[model samples]
Target: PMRYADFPTLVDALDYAALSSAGMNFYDRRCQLEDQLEYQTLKARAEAGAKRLLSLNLKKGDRVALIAETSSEFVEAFFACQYAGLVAVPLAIPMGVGQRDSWSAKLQGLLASCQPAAIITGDEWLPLVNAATHDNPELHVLSHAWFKALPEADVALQRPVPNDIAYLQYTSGSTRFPRGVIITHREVMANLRAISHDGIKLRPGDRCVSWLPFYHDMGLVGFLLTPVATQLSVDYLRTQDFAMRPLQWLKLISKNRGTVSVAPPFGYELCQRRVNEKDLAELDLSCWRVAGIGAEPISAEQLHQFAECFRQVNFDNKTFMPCYGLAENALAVSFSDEASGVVVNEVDRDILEYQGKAVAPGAETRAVSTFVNCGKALPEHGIEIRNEAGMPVAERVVGHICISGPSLMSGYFGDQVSQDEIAATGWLDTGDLGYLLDGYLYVTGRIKDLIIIRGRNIWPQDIEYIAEQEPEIHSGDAIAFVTAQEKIILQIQCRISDEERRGQLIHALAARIQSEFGVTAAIDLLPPHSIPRTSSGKPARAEAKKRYQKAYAAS
Candidate 1:
């Protein structure tokens, strides 16, 4: 593993690599090494960008908006902000599923919130960017092509200190409003060091392959920044390209001998379902070492199926590492032991959800739920579970998961979060509910997503999981929540075109949920693609709930 102790700031870390090990490969969407950037060249271009920004009179800690797509230009702009001592606020591009007006509204909302001096995007999203910045004519909107064409200015660049803000990582919009997570240079470096040395144990010649979006935390910190800081070559696939041809991710890894990669469970599932016998026979995944699974609620069955399907390609199941984290911590909080495979704990479902305990299911028990152990916190971090009364909970008892570490974010931007509300016993509330057993953390569900029925706690994922078990229902197709009157409502995305068939499926879903949980649920069969998703592709439960309520009122 590389040492970053001598580097006080992120700029310093990149500078060291630019001098020491300069050349590294970056692949394009077609698995082509079309744009390779040596560390020295990358640093030089970023310095030029810094100089240009300085010429514009951008001061230290100024906010620079970047439409973060996976490209060499996006990377240069990010580091340019770093060298210029400006905070880069990476923004998400339109997902192309929702309405143009809705996308415009969201873009405007984010722009208004960040109040950035300048916004950088590609030609593809120029119209949308123009609409977003129309009311604020003073806000500069520059395309990647335009930015690259700017003359390099001659100026001494101001570098950031360790305590200075690194970037503003906006949270996945699972809620009504998404707040930007304020990560400092020190915090980001701590995470990068921990991820490189302790988490994945990256060594010399280790290369990274990823299809995660650059706007997201995992894509930004996990692949982009970490690989650059550690002086490792990284292969990239545009997130859109991966969605269209999932097998190409593996093909590139097999072709390039890629060693480390991370994805949500759905990415693995996509590969397992799409890749056929011929494709598997030709590919070699034995060289792939760390196949990280995180960024969402992980399914043990999905992992097992993916491993089983790819075993012929020498894809060892042991490479599967279950991890836990959020943007608040920069990227990672805990990672399961490398090459140890996934550890699943089967517990009594009733006890887990209703009793708030992770008790082992009996031999005669029919209801069981499995949770993947996300392992322990980083060596520099501390994790604890607490109840609503602000007291620590015992092992195997579910509660709010809190964490404290050197890599923790300073605070949320544009939001006044009190110190007491954020910290309890020196740990920051992670807002996730989970339990610890034998030092391994197993996440149950989001505390905000939990449902209460007759004073009993019900995890919405449990209900959603049962609904997804049907052959016609896809994973994440069902959202379970309670209304103002404490009535259970299950909103299912109906893929069946025939009304009768869809009705039958909804009836079956309601029956299964009732028979399994002994609770009556009002089933709302939504049209295909009716349900919304967060930027990271998780079901936007909060947003779905609002739509549900809005429709309920209209009815």
Candidate 2:
């Protein structure tokens, strides 16, 4: 009964799945059943929407940007692009009203890059979309409700080919130049097939639940595309809804008897913080098979905390499927054995950073850090660890992660990639720094994000994890970054107002980091919600570092 997405294009994938009984379900903030768009209905609606999109007289291959929200309308609009041979670009919605400037700038950069013909969005985001595209008078900003009412065009639907651009996945660039990964029909299909066959390994009756944003790689391709292509019933909670009531994620799984769901470390960490013993009585996680964790650094310590919290709810530690991927690869590269519960490569931190060796921890048992094993490459994919000079290295030697695979992107949408980028593509040099151990990929941290405290090599994650140990400071609030001047700065959104206690907290955290890493750090305590985050809610440390340097220069 499972087709495993063995289709030429996404249009065909949706076409085939429409024959099935499976569909997607959405839940509200309180975890109430909001809408259930069956695949049968989705296809019919998408085809009609395709005609409506065609009526706009947009040529084939024209980019249509969608202000993505996890709803039936967004799904239909995306699929409508597939049917009409148009490229669909899902833009990130405004996360915070406070993030308007940052969000508007990001959208504007993307608009300048891709130059979409039209943008379809809901009433909620109309004003922002209008603001973003004011310069481009030709760019149509049609509300989906309005777009749907447009009469169908003469019905000669032109679907996309293998080489056609499927969509442009934008990286969270520095609000200046947002890079969009140009994924084609073939590339994304390869990933979809590889994901269904090799990564998650879809099973009959397997249902998925997700709170990840539709704009994200793992969210769009992994949950949105993969589930539909695989014909698996999926449950959804808007990213904001999940943030408001984190427990509803688990509740959806319990109610629907859901089997699969993926989120980064923070999702589980949030649920862990929001969970209670009494809530556990009503929750059931035994049905959850693939509890995926990725899309940023994976914290084993914090993951264990989530496991311990939900242990009573029959949440299996073995279900913790740690995976490695980026937007460029169309979502997945490798997956730790579904059975292996977050395999960690515990190595000497000093030897790793200083000597670049992933050797045993006991060189007299020196300082250590646990890098989660992100598993082996998918079938036909090759992952190589290369050194600083762009040469491949032997196993267990830490280096930049470079991947060679079928799912590789064509190029950046409107930018030149370079030699590694080549005039064309293969073996994409992932900015992630990690090493391979006995076929398992252990991600260290982002090479770009690697924090050099003094002459010693220290990971940004290492500093943040250490800071989270403080009594008052929580996981999400503490943002650690070194200024361009090489001064160590740990920014904390402190809760307490008293300047005396705030100073004490800063001193204590700074001293703790200094004592542990042997490098002095100054903690800057600020008001609540002062820290900025990414579109999908990851801490925007690069921006934080930039702002810090700007302030430093001003002073």
Candidate 3:
């Protein structure tokens, strides 16, 4: 029987689940299970590890930074923190550690933010971690093997309280010095309960499969914590492996009969592009129930294409559960109805572009903007669309997306700007632009990413989509921003080296932007892989804008 993850604390959740026969499985690049940790065995090892961590004499709530790899070691290490009443801070390590120059600096910034008393990581990542630590003798940085060999303290295990800081989650695409979203055990548990009971209605034996990075909210809370709390077995593929062999993610789900999985639209798009007829023959995606899509701006057209690509493999379109969330909410806000595959609203692109209102296309409609409905807020939670006055707006009125729920994080670990912002407006402003129709939420784009010209608001994604429509360009290749003079600059990472071809493409893109939005845009084409990306793999549009200003000089 399933319990709906109604535990008071993660320690209690893990303890309760340890009485069952459920466990976790980690897969390799080839989709082979390389490690397994049943809940009973996991709980035992975690308890022992908790004592070992206690031997260091670290105070309760002391931050222990952990490089989150998709493995049993990471799972055990995270649980050990819970058992020892220590706050686990999951941090991201670049795919290439020693080889990458920016990683050391990046990791250093994250370390400065959290000020972890100890850092735990794999042997391969130890050097990078060491490089970032600046030889802080007080901060204990140890490899997993070394960490496991430490003597177990004789002190009794300190079980975490509901109010304890469970972990500090850092959102990607945040300022270079990413602020950690402080999620308490009580707050996270509330989200888990809401996600399991109200969001997806988890059933007994509802196994989840994921390739999302452990550092991400979807992977950490959704796949890792949810499975343990609900006593369900789950399968995992390393994020790096998934990027190399995306279909293996689906292959593991098919072979293991995975019942649930979550990914951003990009994951689905990757598998769709890589899947051949032969790969489809081997997959039986009929078992997958809750196929969630979120964590970035969603493309309904792209999602529909993925569904069409996988239809032969028994991949049900209805399994696509488009959701709305951010790291601050602990993972999820709302999930689209299970019955509706992909609920998209086609609004008048003209009125929405200039009027800041979402309405049905009228006689003067030039283009129809399709927005995917992310469904209603979870039970016991509320969502609001607010204007510049910070007051709630009527339905179909596009504005800032705001949320109020028990799952909200306490605050950024040490930052108070966002805390004050939330205090000012009684709800958490998601910093996203969207509108509500009936009861469903349709996300447009980020508030900061929105481009303003002559008092008209233009979504960056809308223009990015226009660039992606060209044959040579691809999604994630274009970054759009406005200059100091309010001139539209569409920066693209072009693959073609032929100057003649590149010149024509730029002119074509500019013409399309003008024809589509009545704006004469400046197309800046750069070499492939030139655009900067956030830690979570999102294009850093703000950073791109800053870089542009530095080069062009508002001076």
Candidate 4:
């Protein structure tokens, strides 16, 4: 089963697989290339596109920038460069909530860090990419649509080493600086193999589909690469399309007989938000064997609701897969078997925070109190729970979750300040606060400034720090955190006495948090509860977030 070679890049392992699929329809939607001839023609265009990009010329190690949405040409261009031996550095289409200036600054920082040779964008998006990185005029540019229409190339694809940095995945910059995680060919393949084998059990001839954005780790490595590795057919829906109509994602799989697909809780949430009862009657979803609820916290309620909503459509509740992985682990480190009933843990929330273990739900706690289990680790990987003292803890004891495996990234791309932050004892401190109960991971909170929104990590400070700058609010009266609602809701305490002025401050605070964080808020402007302070006078954010959630709900 192992493709053993002295060295294996994604291109090398997938050589025969790619050739077999040649002339097959690989991509559609934007920039569709339906058959192998068109795909090959596009590949030639991308190569020539790369060549003409810089009359300055390029080398193997040089990085090329790509900024675009999900499109056939973008997918074609991504593989084409790898076939042509160029490092493709993908940047997320900048946030719409983030103003042009903020996006330009972010682009400048990335440009300064990587110093890419040239940037490529779709003809539609080239103006934006160019304008954003305009400060660097020396950079070259090209479009995939134009490039592949040209002549075929004589040069054969040259495979790079396993250790060669394949792509630089930039963090969402929710908090602090965004550092690129250097993912090499070996690590990618190792992670892909783990995912294909254990996570989704992807098989040849299986059809996969997704509407998740390619810039996200789960969307890219988990769904995209693993399918190709297994030589499975995939139908990719536009990332924007899902936003407009989330039910389309479910409808696509139903219509396509997609046996494998995955997404976070929010995907289902969006569907529930927009989909009515009538929408479920139109399709058959019996073929979907894997519904990955991850890339953020998994909610048992959301999972259950999704199942009930689609029950008449023959959607199996057993197929709901609650799993976990990070950028450090390419995509998936653990997945529940489709045969096992959905795993869930119901524990006393208070006991979990203080004593660090789940206490069984009693008559005193009639609440479902459920949290989905993200399964156990893959056979090739190892997971452990450790206390603050660094001692390994037993099952049912909540602590730090650490993982070690071939799939984990070597380390962060360019960080030098903290060597010990990630202990290389082969154990990666997932920075997740969680525990194993009968061997399944039940994550609590993150070790860093994180907020979980519909299972995605939103940084707490990303909302709070910006909210503090409002003129009407006193400095540092703001704290923000994730609520069960899966949005970063701001909690502000102000000393303003006039009720009218206070109401104004609250609205301003909520608006600013929305504009800055792209997250909604449940603002609480307490008269003088002005936030509880620790013994040292710093804001007790945990207490504040809890209190705000309580007050927000009551009002």
lDDT string, candidate 2, 1-555, tens digits: 788979888888988889899999888887788888999899999888889998998988799999889998899999888888888999888867877877887888888888899999999999888887879988988998899988999878876789988898885455666777888888899999988999888898898899888988788998899988898889899988888888888988998889999998888888988787767778988998989999888989888989888888899999999998988788899998967888888998888878787987884966888989899989988899999888989888989998877788877777664324634547778888999999889998877777865556788778877767776778767777777888888888867877898777778777888888888888788888897776545678877888888888887
With candidate 2 superimposed using the best TM-score fit, by how many Å does residue 479's alpha carbon deviate from the native?
Answer: 2.3
Q: With candidate 2 superimposed using the best TM-score fit, by how many Å does residue 494's alpha carbon deviate from the native?
A: 2.2
Q: What is the lDDT of every predicted structure here?
A: 0.83, 0.85, 0.86, 0.66
The TM-scores, one per candidate, come to 0.95, 0.97, 0.97, 0.76
**Lowest-sum lDDT 10-residue window in model 1:** 417-426
Higher-scoring candidate on lDDT, 2 or 4:
2
For model 3, residues 1-555, the per-residue Cα lDDT tens digits are: 678888999999999889999899888888877988999999999999899998999889899999999889999999999898888999876746343677766777777788889989999888867776775667999899989999999998866788889999876435476778889998899999998998877888689898988888788999999998899999899998998888998899899889999998889988887788777778998998888898887889998999898888898999888998888889889889875788899998878878999999888888889999899989888889999988889999999988887898777887788777655654787788999998999998888788988868888888999888887787888999898778989999978888898888888888888998888899988887787677656778888888888888745
Please provide, for model 4 over 14-65, each residue's C-alpha lDDT reduced to its tens digit, 9 standing for 90 to 100. Answer: 5535444522233344323333333334445545554443234567777877
Query: Candidate 1 on 1-555: residue-level lDDT in tens?
Result: 466333568898888777755454656656778777777788998898888777767778789999998888888999999998989999888878456666777777676667788888999999888976789886888898888777666777766789999899875443347577888899899898888888778888788999998888898999888877787778888899999889889989999898999998889988987887766765999999999999887899999999999888899999999999898889898899877899999898887767889899997777888999898878879888899987999999999998888888877776666334455345688889899999889987787778877758888888888777777777778898888667888888867788887778778877888898999899888887778687556777766776777877886
Model 4 residue-pair collision total: 5
Candidate RMSDs in Å, in order, are 2.0, 1.6, 1.7, 9.4
Clashing pairs in 3: none
Off by over 4 Å in 1: 4-6, 20-29, 172-176, 418-425
**lDDT (Cα) of model 3:** 0.86
